[PDB]
Amino acid sequence: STAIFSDRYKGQRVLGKGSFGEVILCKDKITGQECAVKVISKRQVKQKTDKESLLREVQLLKQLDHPNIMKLYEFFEDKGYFYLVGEVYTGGELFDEIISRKRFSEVDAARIIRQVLSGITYMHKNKIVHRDLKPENLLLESKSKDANIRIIDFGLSTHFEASKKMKDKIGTAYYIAPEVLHGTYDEKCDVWSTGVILYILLSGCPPFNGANEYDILKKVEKGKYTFELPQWKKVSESAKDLIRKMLTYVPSMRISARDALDHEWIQTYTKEVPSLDNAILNIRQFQGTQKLAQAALLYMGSKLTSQDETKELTAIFHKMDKNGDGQLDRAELIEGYKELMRMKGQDASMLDASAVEHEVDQVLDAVDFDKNGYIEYSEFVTVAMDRKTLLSRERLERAFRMFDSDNSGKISSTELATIFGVSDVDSETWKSVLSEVDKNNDGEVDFDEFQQMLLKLCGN
Numbered sequence: 411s412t413a414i415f416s417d418r419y420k421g422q423r424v425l426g427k428g429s430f431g432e433v434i435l436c437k438d439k440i441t442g443q444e445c446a447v448k449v450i451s452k453r454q455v456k457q458k459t460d461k462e463s464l465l466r467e468v469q470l471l472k473q474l475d476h477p478n479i480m481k482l483y484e485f486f487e488d489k490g491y492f493y494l495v496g497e498v499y500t501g502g503e504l505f506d507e508i509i510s511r512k513r514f515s516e517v518d519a520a521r522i523i524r525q526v527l528s529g530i531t532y533m534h535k536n537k538i539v540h541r542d543l544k545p546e547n548l549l550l551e552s553k554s555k556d557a558n559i560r561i562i563d564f565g566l567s568t569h570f571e572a573s574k575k576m577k578d579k580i581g582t583a584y585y586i587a588p589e590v591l592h593g594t595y596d597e598k599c600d601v602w603s604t605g606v607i608l609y610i611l612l613s614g615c616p617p618f619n620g621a622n623e624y625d626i627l628k629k630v631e632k633g634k635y636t637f638e639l640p641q642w643k644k645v646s647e648s649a650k651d652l653i654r655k656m657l658t659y660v661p662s663m664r665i666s667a668r669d670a671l672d673h674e675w676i677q678t679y680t681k682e683v684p685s686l687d688n689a690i691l692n693i694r695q696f697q698g699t700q701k702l703a704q705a706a707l708l709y710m711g712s713k714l715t716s717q718d719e720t721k722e723l724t725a726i727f728h729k730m731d732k733n734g735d736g737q738l739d740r741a742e743l744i745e746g747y748k749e750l751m752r753m754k755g756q757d758a759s760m761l762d763a764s765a766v767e768h769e770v771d772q773v774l775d776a777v778d779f780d781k782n783g784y785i786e787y788s789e790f791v792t793v794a795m796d797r798k799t800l801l802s803r804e805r806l807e808r809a810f811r812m813f814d815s816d817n818s819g820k821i822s823s824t825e826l827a828t829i830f831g832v833s834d835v836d837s838e839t840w841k842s843v844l845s846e847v848d849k850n851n852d853g854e855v856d857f858d859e860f861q862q863m864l865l866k867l868c869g870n
């Protein structure tokens with residue numbers, strides 16, 4: 411009796427999308443314990459190692475315990491998926507909390523960074539390297555002000571090939587250690603990344619920056635950065651010294667996570683100082699830019715997914731309609747939706763037959779439909795897809811409002827440049843699209859215009 415994931419857990423809702431897959435909030439069917447399950451599709455993510463190697467790693471990770479590292483509880487594998495069952499954390503990304511503060515200082519930075527260093531040190535002792543460490547991988551344990559930081563995804567880079575899709579790689583270039591690019595790397599790459607995160611926490615700007623991904627990688631590969639911005643005047647030599655040691659090019663010369671923990675700056679500023687307002691302002695801008703480019707690409711993706719699935723669902727139902735009537739019953743809509751799921755394999759939310767049944771019922775409950783006298787498939791398809799798109803279009807509007815910090819309703823041509831640079835959409839291409847939406851415009855777009863540009867950039 412091999413164990414099966416859905417015999418034990420039922421999905422409650424989606425928490426979001428991370429590296430390698432979807433994260434679902436799940437519940438144990440017997441104990442009622444809540445857990446965050448990372449679902450990695452074997453069809454979308456290629457393994458780098460053999461099965462042996464990964465199971466060994468999973469066994470080790472289940473035995474490791476540290477207050478700043480996500481806790482893994484269980485592991486399931488079936489034909490199409492791996493299921494990584496872990497502790498649920500409700501505090502969100504670090505940077506999302508930081509932008510909401512009214513005050514931020516070198517003491518707060520230092521408390522953050524020594525939580526990070528402490529989880530890393532621990533993991534390196536057990537010979538586990540993160541490699542893809544960045545702000546998105548730092549969650550707060552709870553919505554409390556005093557909440558601990560938990561590092562997610564320690565261990566996945568060793569076993570899974572990262573996505574080349576830009577919707578997944580957005581914002582990774584700032585943090586990656588030069589030696590990781592060239593291919594010969596060890597645990598010190600995690601110190602580099604942390605050194606970058608500290609630079610951003612104290613100034614609000616990345617030390618290596620650029621108008622697009624490859625521009626950013628060129629800076630990193632040269633390894634040159636400076637403290638020649640005005641806001642570094644507000645920051646102790648001590649912190650700059652730690653940064654220097656963490657951003658040391660040659661790894662053998664770069665400080666270890668453990669020796670970073672014993673550095674003067676950490677010692678001084680994590681004991682019981684000016685607010686860094688410019689830093690917090692730059693971070694609020696940097697964060698907004700990223701989340702808007704991210705949401706742009708996920709909107710484009712959602713629209714493309716939708717077209718794929720509308721045509722597919724329509725063809726499944728046309729075929730299933732042996733009458734030629736355009737009328738299916740509940741049990742068929744379900745059979746068809748399920749067969750969409752067999753063919754795609756994209757919904758972590760539809761983890762079992764019962765998750766599908768309920769989704770169908772939510773759709774039937776939406777349309778003005780007698781549910782126990784059979785339904786017009788055309789209209790079920792419309793409501794079902796919109797429902798899918800909803801999360802992504804609502805998020806787009808929200809990331810747009812949050813980016814528009816002065817509530818002007820508009821974003822300048824200069825701001826778009828930065829947004830499409832980060833989203834790695836060719837410059838000539840988006841200017842060309844901006845020309846065709848509003849052919850009278852004056853280098854600013856509202857939300858409706860911006861959205862039309864995106865629809866045009868994904869083939870519509």
Ligand SMILES: CC(C)(C)n1nc(-c2ccc3nc(OC4CCC4)ccc3c2)c(C(N)=O)c1N
Nearest residue numbers: 425426428433446448494496497498499562565
């Ligand atoms: C914010 C979002 C990205 C939606 N997220 N993601 C997780 C999360 C992250 C990494 C995980 N890794 C797991 O296993 C690790 C063992 C190597 C990967 C298992 C569950 C995870 C949940 C997570 C959580 N655990 O609460 C959460 N809130």
